[PDB]
Coordinates of C-alpha atoms in Angstrom, one line a residue:
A1 CA -13.6 3.9 16.1
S2 CA -12.6 5.0 19.2
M3 CA -8.7 3.8 19.9
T4 CA -9.2 0.3 22.1
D5 CA -10.7 -0.6 18.8
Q6 CA -9.0 0.6 16.8
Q7 CA -6.2 -1.2 19.1
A8 CA -8.8 -4.3 18.6
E9 CA -7.7 -3.1 15.2
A10 CA -4.9 -3.8 14.9
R11 CA -4.2 -6.6 16.5
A12 CA -6.2 -8.0 13.8
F13 CA -4.6 -7.1 11.1
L14 CA -1.0 -8.7 12.0
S15 CA -0.5 -12.9 13.4
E16 CA 0.6 -13.4 16.8
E17 CA 4.5 -14.2 15.6
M18 CA 4.4 -10.7 13.7
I19 CA 3.3 -8.5 16.9
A20 CA 5.5 -11.4 18.7
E21 CA 8.3 -10.8 16.3
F22 CA 7.5 -6.8 16.6
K23 CA 7.5 -6.6 20.1
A24 CA 10.9 -8.1 20.5
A25 CA 12.4 -5.4 18.7
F26 CA 10.0 -2.2 21.0
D27 CA 11.0 -4.4 24.2
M28 CA 15.1 -3.6 23.6
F29 CA 14.0 0.4 23.7
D30 CA 12.2 0.2 27.2
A31 CA 14.2 -1.3 30.3
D32 CA 12.0 0.1 32.5
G33 CA 9.9 -3.0 31.7
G34 CA 6.9 0.1 31.5
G35 CA 5.5 -1.7 28.2
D36 CA 6.7 1.7 26.6
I37 CA 9.0 3.4 24.9
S38 CA 10.5 7.3 24.4
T39 CA 8.6 9.1 22.0
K40 CA 11.6 9.6 20.5
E41 CA 12.3 6.5 19.6
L42 CA 9.7 5.6 18.1
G43 CA 11.2 6.6 14.0
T44 CA 13.9 4.4 14.6
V45 CA 11.7 1.7 16.7
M46 CA 9.3 1.6 13.2
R47 CA 12.5 2.1 10.8
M48 CA 14.6 -0.7 12.2
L49 CA 10.2 -2.8 11.3
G50 CA 10.4 -1.9 8.0
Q51 CA 8.7 1.3 8.2
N52 CA 9.5 4.3 6.6
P53 CA 7.4 7.5 8.3
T54 CA 8.3 11.1 7.1
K55 CA 9.3 13.4 9.8
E56 CA 5.9 15.3 8.7
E57 CA 4.1 11.6 9.9
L58 CA 6.3 11.2 13.2
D59 CA 5.4 14.5 14.2
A60 CA 1.9 13.6 13.9
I61 CA 2.0 10.3 15.9
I62 CA 3.8 11.4 18.5
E63 CA 1.1 14.7 19.2
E64 CA -2.0 12.4 18.5
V65 CA -0.3 10.1 21.6
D66 CA 1.5 12.2 24.1
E67 CA -1.1 14.4 24.8
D68 CA -0.2 13.6 28.8
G69 CA 3.1 15.0 27.8
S70 CA 4.3 11.8 30.0
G71 CA 7.3 11.6 27.0
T72 CA 5.9 8.0 25.5
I73 CA 3.9 5.6 23.2
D74 CA 3.1 2.1 24.3
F75 CA 2.8 -0.4 22.6
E76 CA -1.0 -0.7 21.8
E77 CA -0.6 2.6 20.2
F78 CA 2.1 1.0 18.7
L79 CA 0.4 -1.6 17.0
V80 CA -2.6 1.3 15.9
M81 CA 1.4 2.9 14.0
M82 CA 3.2 0.5 13.5
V83 CA -1.3 -1.4 11.1
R84 CA -1.4 3.1 10.0
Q85 CA 1.6 3.0 8.0
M86 CA 2.1 -0.7 6.7
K87 CA -1.2 0.4 4.5
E88 CA 0.0 3.3 3.5
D89 CA 3.8 2.0 2.4
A90 CA 1.6 -1.2 1.0
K91 CA -0.3 1.7 -1.2
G92 CA 2.4 3.4 -1.6
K93 CA 3.9 0.1 -3.5
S94 CA 1.0 -0.9 -5.4
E95 CA 0.5 2.6 -7.1
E96 CA 4.8 3.0 -8.4
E97 CA 4.3 -0.5 -9.2
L98 CA 1.0 -0.2 -12.0
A99 CA 2.5 3.3 -12.7
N100 CA 5.0 0.4 -14.1
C101 CA 3.3 -1.8 -16.1
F102 CA 1.9 1.2 -18.4
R103 CA 5.0 2.3 -19.2
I104 CA 5.8 -1.7 -20.6
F105 CA 2.7 -3.2 -21.5
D106 CA 2.4 0.8 -23.7
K107 CA 4.9 0.2 -26.1
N108 CA 5.7 3.1 -28.2
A109 CA 5.2 4.5 -25.0
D110 CA 2.4 7.0 -26.8
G111 CA 0.9 7.2 -23.3
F112 CA -2.1 5.0 -24.4
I113 CA -2.9 0.4 -24.2
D114 CA -3.9 -0.1 -28.4
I115 CA -5.6 -3.5 -28.6
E116 CA -2.5 -5.1 -30.2
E117 CA -0.8 -3.7 -28.1
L118 CA -3.9 -5.3 -25.6
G119 CA -3.5 -8.8 -27.4
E120 CA 0.3 -9.5 -27.5
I121 CA 0.4 -8.8 -23.9
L122 CA -2.2 -10.5 -23.3
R123 CA -1.5 -13.6 -25.8
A124 CA 2.4 -14.1 -24.0
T125 CA 1.0 -14.9 -20.8
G126 CA 0.3 -18.5 -22.7
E127 CA -3.5 -18.7 -21.7
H128 CA -5.9 -19.4 -23.5
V129 CA -7.0 -16.1 -24.4
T130 CA -9.3 -15.6 -28.0
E131 CA -9.2 -12.6 -29.6
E132 CA -12.7 -12.3 -29.0
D133 CA -12.0 -12.5 -25.3
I134 CA -9.0 -9.6 -25.6
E135 CA -11.8 -6.9 -27.9
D136 CA -14.4 -8.1 -24.4
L137 CA -11.2 -6.5 -21.9
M138 CA -10.6 -3.1 -24.6
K139 CA -14.6 -2.4 -24.9
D140 CA -15.4 -3.6 -20.5
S141 CA -11.9 -0.8 -19.5
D142 CA -12.4 1.7 -22.7
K143 CA -14.8 4.5 -20.7
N144 CA -14.9 6.8 -23.2
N145 CA -15.4 4.3 -26.6
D146 CA -11.6 6.1 -28.6
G147 CA -10.5 2.1 -28.5
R148 CA -7.8 2.8 -26.3
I149 CA -6.5 2.7 -22.5
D150 CA -5.2 5.2 -20.6
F151 CA -3.3 5.2 -17.8
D152 CA -6.1 6.3 -14.9
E153 CA -8.3 3.9 -17.5
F154 CA -5.9 1.2 -16.7
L155 CA -6.1 2.3 -13.0
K156 CA -9.3 1.7 -13.0
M157 CA -9.0 -1.6 -15.3
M158 CA -6.6 -3.0 -12.8
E159 CA -7.7 -1.9 -9.4
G160 CA -11.3 -3.0 -11.2
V161 CA -13.8 -2.2 -8.0
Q162 CA -11.3 1.1 -9.7

């Protein structure tokens, strides 16, 4: 995947109204209507659009897009950078939320989900789940056969592929 390749994939990832919205923000920093903005304003536009890159991350991006020393970033490269950041932030959010889901499921906080805690949470959903169904989930998820689900096994169970 080349940069233009990366650019077509960034556009395919977003709806067109989202892309127009992003450009509406981006254009407020252009001025010259060149289709580019100063690398010094990249962090500001990304934050305005809900992203939270670290300073180290911004420096890395700038270094990747400004090799000719023009001091600018164009809109197509900006979309690539936005999509990279959106993917990283969403995965961060998903990991944090799974850690909270686990602390909640583990009622006695012993660091493991046991069959009684698993059945209680599945039954509370209102679904017509049977004890066989709960036991089936426990066996398929308990990779070391200790009768319980630890956090590593919980992440694998939930992410599935995982």
